[PDB]
Structure 1
Amino acid sequence: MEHVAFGSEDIENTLAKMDDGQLDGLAFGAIQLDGDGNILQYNAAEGDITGRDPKQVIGKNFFKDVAPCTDSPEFYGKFKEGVASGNLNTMFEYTFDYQMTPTKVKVHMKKALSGDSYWVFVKRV
C-alpha cells in the first residue's frame, strides 16, 4: 500500500509523482479533474466506494454526467469558486446518492501542484 494519509498538508506534492497505478494503491478515493470538471484520473478505492468502473468514467464530466448529486452550491459551487480563484483547499461531509445506496463520505478538494488540475479525495465516514 502507498502510505499517504487523507488530509495531509502536502498531499498534492506526494501525489504529483503518482501514475494511475500508484494512485490505485491509496487508502482513500482520489479523482483528478481539470478546470471544467472532466475526469483525468479515478482510482480503485473510489470505484470501491461508488460502484463506478474507473476506466469507464475517465473523460466524462464529473458534475454533469457522473455525479449530478454534486451539482449544487455546496460541492460544484465550491469547486468552481476555487478554479476561478486559482486556489482551493476545503473539506466537508457529503452524501453520494445517485444510482447507489446513499453513502456518507468526507470530501477533501485541493488544487493540484500541476496547472489546471484539481483533486477530489473521498473516504467513508
Structure 2
Amino acid sequence: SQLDNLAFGAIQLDGDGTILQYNAAEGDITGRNPKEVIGKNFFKDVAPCTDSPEFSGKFKEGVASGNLNTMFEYTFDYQMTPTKVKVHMKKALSGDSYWVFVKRV
C-alpha cells in the first residue's frame, strides 16, 4: 500500500535532490512535518548535514552515471538531537527517481 505504512523512513527525490515524497516514519525520526518539506531540496535546505561528499556527492555521481545503490551509516544532527542512522540510497528500479531509506541504528 502506503508509504506511510513503512516502519522505516522513506524519501523519494528527483535527480536535483528535490523532495517528491516523505513518509511519517522519517518525520518521526527527524521532527520534520512531511507536508512541509515536500518540494524543498533535501541536500541544501532540509538536511544540510548531508551535503557532503559521501552523501550528496555520492548521490550526484549516481545521478550522472545512472548507477546508484549504496548503504552507509550517517548522523543526522541539524535542528534535532544527533541521531545515528543507516541510509540506503538508490536509483529507483523503475521510472526516473531516487530513494533514500533510513533506519535508526
**Structure 1 unaligned residues grouped into runs of 5+:** 1-20
Moved over 2 A (4+): 113-116
Instruction: Write out aligned runs for 1:1-125 (5 A).
Output: 22-125=2-105
* Cα distance, 1:115 vs structure 2: 3.1
* Cα distance, 1:27 vs structure 2: 1.2
What secondary structure, in the 3-state scheme, does the structure 1 residue paired with 2:36 have? helix
* Cα distance, 1:116 vs structure 2: 2.5
State the TM-score, normalized to the length of structure 2: 0.97
What secondary structure, in the 3-state scheme, does the structure 2 residue paired with 1:45 have? helix
Residues 5-64 of structure 1: per-residue CA shift (max 9 Å, x gap): xxxxxxxxxxxxxxxx70000010000000000000000000000000001000000011
Instruction: Judge which range, 50-59 or 105-114, deviates more.
Output: 105-114
Residues 79-100 of structure 1: per-residue CA shift (max 9 Å, x gap): 0010001011000000000011
What secondary structure, in the 3-state scheme, does the structure 1 residue paired with 2:54 have? coil
CA-based RMSD:
1.0
Count of matched residue positions in the alignment of Structure 1 and Structure 2: 105
Q: Could you say which structure has the larger radius of gyration?
A: 1
User: Identity across aligned pairs (percent)?
Assistant: 94
State the TM-score, normalized to the length of structure 1: 0.82
CA distance in 2, matches of 1:109, 1:76: 10
CA distance in 2, matches of 1:74, 1:120: 14
**Structure 2 unaligned residues grouped into runs of 5+:** none
